[PDB]
Amino acid sequence: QRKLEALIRDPRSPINVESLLDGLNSLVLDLDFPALRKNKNIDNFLNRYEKIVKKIRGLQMKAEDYDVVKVIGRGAFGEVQLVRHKASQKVYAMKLLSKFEMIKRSDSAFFWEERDIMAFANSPWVVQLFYAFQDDRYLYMVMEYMPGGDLVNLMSNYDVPEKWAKFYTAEVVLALDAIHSMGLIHRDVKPDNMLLDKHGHLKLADFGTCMKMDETGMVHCDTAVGTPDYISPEVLKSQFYGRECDWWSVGVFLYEMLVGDTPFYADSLVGTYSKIMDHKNSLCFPEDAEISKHAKNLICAFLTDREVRLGRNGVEEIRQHPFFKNDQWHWDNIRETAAPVVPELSSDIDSSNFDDIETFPIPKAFVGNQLPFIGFTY
Numbered sequence: 001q002r003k004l005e006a007l008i009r010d011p012r013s014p015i016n017v018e019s020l021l022d023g024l025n026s027l028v029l030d031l032d033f034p035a036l037r038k039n040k041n042i043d044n045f046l047n048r049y050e051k052i053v054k055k056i057r058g059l060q061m062k063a064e065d066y067d068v069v070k071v072i073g074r075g076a077f078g079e080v081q082l083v084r085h086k087a088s089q090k091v092y093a094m095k096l097l098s099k100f101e102m103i104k105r106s107d108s109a110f111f112w113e114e115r116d117i118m119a120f121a122n123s124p125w126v127v128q129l130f131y132a133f134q135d136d137r138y139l140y141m142v143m144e145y146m147p148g149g150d151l152v153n154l155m156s157n158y159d160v161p162e163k164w165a166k167f168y169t170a171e172v173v174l175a176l177d178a179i180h181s182m183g184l185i186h187r188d189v190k191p192d193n194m195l196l197d198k199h200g201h202l203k204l205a206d207f208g209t210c211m212k213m214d215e216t217g218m219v220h221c222d223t224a225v226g227t228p229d230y231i232s233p234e235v236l237k238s239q240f241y242g243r244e245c246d247w248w249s250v251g252v253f254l255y256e257m258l259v260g261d262t263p264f265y266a267d268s269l270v271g272t273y274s275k276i277m278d279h280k281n282s283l284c285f286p287e288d289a290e291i292s293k294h295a296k297n298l299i300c301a302f303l304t305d306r307e308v309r310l311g312r313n314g315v316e317e318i319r320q321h322p323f324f325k326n327d328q329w330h331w332d333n334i335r336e337t338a339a340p341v342v343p344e345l346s347s348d349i350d351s352s353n354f355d356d357i358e359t360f361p362i363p364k365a366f367v368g369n370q371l372p373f374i375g376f377t378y
């Protein structure tokens with residue numbers, strides 16, 4: 001009874017009010033179809049509740065509460081939209097995940113970690129989640145908007161000098177160190193996921209791939225999850241690794257920022273795959289691109305096999321690398337210092353740093369499509 005009423009209050013709890021209400025809406029959704037409403041039990045339960053449930057539906061946060069400004073992202077299971085909460089006039093970025101496509105495509109469990117990271121990390125390096133809600137169609141994640149854009153954009157609009165690359169690499173390293181210390185492994189670190197704020201400081205997003213480590217600080221996942229150009233060889237070979245798979249992505253990141261291309265870029269999907277697997281022979285810095293001996297050493301320090309990769313022993317071996325020598329910041333204050341690109345913003349809905357961008361079958365027997373999404377509302 002002690003932990004009972006504590007868990008009804010507790011935001012991390014599966015039996016709090018939002019989850020208890022999720023369970024009721026879900027039950028109503030899943031059952032209200034004449035094909036199933038034939039049943040006396042389904043009918044009397046719907047009779048008693050449909051009127052009240054319809055009333056909560058509107059009393060709770062809806063997609064309807066937001067004016068959809070523009071679409072700033074598009075992923076496997078949905079889109080990211082630039083929105084404004086009608087009542088509060090407050091601007092947020094809202095990520096949408098299609099429930100239909102999460103059932104049709106088998107994967108409908110990644111969002112739990114994604115939500116929890118953003119919701120509770122309370123880290124300058126992690127995009128914050130304010131609200132999480134749902135409807136018959138989607139899963140909605142309301143986040144702190146990042147007007148600075150992503151590092152895909154920054155790279156496309158600039159010739160990135162080593163002074164800038166020093167800063168962004170350092171911010172990514174500390175961001176992944178914060179993710180790691182929460183007992184998490186990103187598995188999908190890439191420029192499309194590195195976002196810039198009002199001040200031009202880095203924050204990570206797309207925590208879908210993320211997995212909780214063992215007591216050993218390792219993960220037993222016999223499936224390759226991530227993006228071609230940035231996947232490490234050990235994760236291609238996984239199809240029992242540590243957090244050093246994220247440092248490999250940092251190597252690729254630095255190489256792309258300096259050279260202008262990814263170090264294993266190929267014509268085909270399997271070509272990149274084969275290039276990565278032969279990194280010892282496929283990786284080479286082009287002559288015309290003037291890369292320092294310190295920048296080359298660090299790309300090479302991460303773009304090796306996991307058994308000798310920099311970071312395998314901790315962040316400290318990364319931090320002390322000669323490449324990070326500068327007259328602008330320290331590992332203890334980068335975020336307090338002025339970023340290389342400070343974004344000029346015309347408005348609170350300025351989306352200039354971002355590029356321009358399903359019907360469930362009515363059942364005849366109980367399916368329970370809403371059940372895997374009970375507890376999502378935060």
Ligand SMILES: O=C(NCc1cccc2c1OCCO2)c1ccc(-c2ccncc2)cc1
Nearest residue numbers: 074075076077078079093144145146205206
């Ligand atoms: O996870 C992201 N995109 C990937 C993505 C989007 C949609 C469905 C997906 C998916 O990935 C795999 C599953 O299906 C993401 C990108 C950018 C922001 C953001 C935050 C603040 N300000 C501006 C932008 C937030 C999240």
